[PDB]
Amino acid sequence: PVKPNYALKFTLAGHTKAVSSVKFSPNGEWLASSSADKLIKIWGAYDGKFEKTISGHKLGISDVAWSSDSNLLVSASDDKTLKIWDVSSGKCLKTLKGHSNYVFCCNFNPQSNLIVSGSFDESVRIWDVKTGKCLKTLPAHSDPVSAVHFNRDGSLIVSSSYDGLCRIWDTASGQCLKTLIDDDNPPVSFVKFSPNGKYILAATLDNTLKLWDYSKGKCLKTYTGHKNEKYCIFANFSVTGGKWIVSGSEDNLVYIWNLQTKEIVQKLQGHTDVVISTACHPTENIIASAALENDKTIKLWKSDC
């Protein structure tokens, strides 16, 4: 409607250090969280009930992502590796080795035969899920890579970096197809394609989110009012109800904007530290949010629209 009405339903406690990332499983049943405590935890998406802990990394984890069938997770760690996990058994199926520094971000493609990763070593790597081998190393950026994401059919990858650039890569060739540059190039702390693949949402460390038309190469919308100068905060498109943009903020709030008019429609209060990560449920109007060291909780919020 005019505005959603997200209200706190559950607070999920259990990580002993900052939460780095939260993601809903594509089937809607689960939430996964990753933490600086080196753990992944699985929670019920609808009741917030703790399910299990998945362990194995030697250092903190910056990101987690689900496979399309909701059976696998990939995690990205400061230990310079990714791990692929069988969620039900908890087994580490593969350890993806090859980055020379912290691995910061990760995602499966829609077919889930590939994983993309970005690292502090300034490269983007494409991996084969079955063999666990690296297929390509792209010399993508001249500073740490902050996010990597496949488009809807897996043909393209978007990457962002502290070097101020967003780049679009051909998955099969590894060719850089596009570099997005605005009037200015502050660090880019997050990027993802819109669900329809026509747009890219990019966060920058000047308290600003930008919606780019991908093939026309131009910034169409801008979202402000939040605080984001230090951390790589996730952002989302919310599509189950009203069309929103959702993001954490360094003032401890979750911000929801009307995608089209660009106005703040709600600010969610409850966290006691930086909201680093938000996720939108695939079928219900539910948002998960997660905070840094002084808070350590995950919250599940639900709206009537």
Binding site: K17, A18, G60, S62, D63
Partner: peptide, 5 residues
């Protein structure tokens, strides 16, 4: 990590 304060 992403959380590094």
């Amino acid at each position: 990590a992403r959380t590094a304060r």
